[PDB]
Each structure stands twice: as structure tokens, then as C-alpha cells.
């Protein structure tokens, strides 16, 4: 469990690696993998689609069942579901959809959900299709998360820009 390796330490509790979060989950066997979700847990692409594909669609079946019973999440909110074959648990976190006008301050609330877990494998919330500036998402993560977060950044150019901008 939690076999993290090859990360660059950014702060006392935030680590970063240029990697596909799916390949990391398979190597690391984390207690918790974070999904960058929407409020309906419809895992249509990005991190969410990659995680769902790696669970052979079991994540989407489980998510549909949960939402049908319980209703949508709130923006900035989260829910723990099974991690299936990738992790013990998946923490589905809804960052704000900045491009659609949702309040970017909810990125703080989104990252605050990480603090209920001692160690997490995670992506940069809202930094893809939701349109938040990745450097900003990293800054909010560093300022908000107090537990141990291992960030997987798939794109090499972005990873280099994030590490350069942080260094």
C-alpha cells in the first residue's frame, strides 16, 4: 500500500511526479486515489474517464447507483466510493468548472476534502477541462492541504512549467 516513488518534494506535505495517475495507481496501490469529478459523477474524459476505464467501467456503474439514490454532489464537495482495482477508496472531488462561471474560491473547499485522508494520490483539480490555471490549482493545493498529497501530472511540458514556476 502507498508505494510512492520517484516524486519531487515541493513542500513538507506536497509531492509531484510526471506520470499518468492510472499508471501510478497501479504501481502505488494507494489507500486513496482522487478523481477530478463533476457533481453527477459522469466520468466522461480527463482523469475521470481514465480512472473509469482502468476500473473496466465499474467506477461508472457504482457512481450512477450512488447518484441515482443520493442526488448530485455540491461543487467543492466530494464523496468516497470504492477504489475498485486501483485503490482502496476513490475520493471523488468536484472542483469548480471555472470556464462555466463557477466560483474559483470553491477550489479551496475542494482541496479541503483531502484533509480527511492521511495520504492521497491525486490530480490537479479543475486544471483540465474545467479551466482553472494549473499553477493556481497547485498553489491552492499547497496552501490548503495539510495531509500528504502525491500529485500526478500527465503532461511533461505542464509538469516542467509547474516545477519551474514553483522553484
Which chain residues interact with ligand RVK by CB under 6 A?
20-22, 36-38, 42-48, 50, 95, 123-130, 134, 152-155
Rounded Cα distance between 91 and 47, Å, is: 13
Q: Cβ 130 to ligand RVK, closest distance in Å?
A: 3
Residue 121 cell numbers, joined: 494520490
Grid cell listed for 80: 468516497
Task: Name the nearest CA neighbour of 40 among 68, 21, 9.
Answer: 68
Q: How far apart are CA 27 and CA 25, in angstroms?
A: 5
Least spacing, CB of residue 44 vs ligand RVK, in Å = 4
Pairing of strands 8-9, 32-37: unpaired
Q: Closest distance between ligand RVK and the C-beta of residue 35, in Å? A: 8
Q: Please identify, using beta-carbon distances, which residue of 119 and 132 lies nearer to ligand RVK.
A: 132
Nearer of residues 30 and 134 to ligand RVK, judged by Cβ: 134
Query: Which residue is nearest to ligand RVK, using beta carbons?
Result: 128
Amino acid at each position: 500500500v502507498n508505494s510512492f516513488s520517484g516524486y519531487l518534494k515541493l513542500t513538507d506535505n506536497v509531492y509531484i511526479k510526471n506520470a499518468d495517475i492510472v499508471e501510478e495507481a497501479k504501481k502505488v496501490k494507494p489507500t486513496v486515489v482522487v478523481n477530478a469529478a463533476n457533481v453527477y459523477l459522469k466520468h466522461g474524459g480527463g482523469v475521470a474517464g481514465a480512472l473509469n476505464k482502468a476500473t473496466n467501467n465499474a467506477m461508472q456503474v457504482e457512481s450512477d447507483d450512488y447518484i441515482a439514490t443520493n442526488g448530485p454532489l455540491k461543487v467543492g464537495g466530494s464523496c468516497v466510493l470504492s477504489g475498485h482495482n486501483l485503490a482502496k477508496h476513490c475520493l471523488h472531488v468536484v472542483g469548480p468548472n471555472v470556464n462555466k462561471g463557477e466560483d474559483i474560491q470553491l477550489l479551496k473547499s475542494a482541496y479541503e476534502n483531502f484533509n480527511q485522508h492521511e495520504v492521497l494520490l491525486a490530480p490537479l483539480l479543475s486544471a483540465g477541462i474545467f479551466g482553472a490555471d494549473p499553477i493556481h490549482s497547485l498553489r491552492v493545493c499547497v496552501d490548503t492541504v495539510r495531509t500528504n498529497v502525491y500529485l500526478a501530472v500527465f503532461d511533461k511540458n505542464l509538469y516542467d512549467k509547474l516545477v519551474s514556476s514553483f522553484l
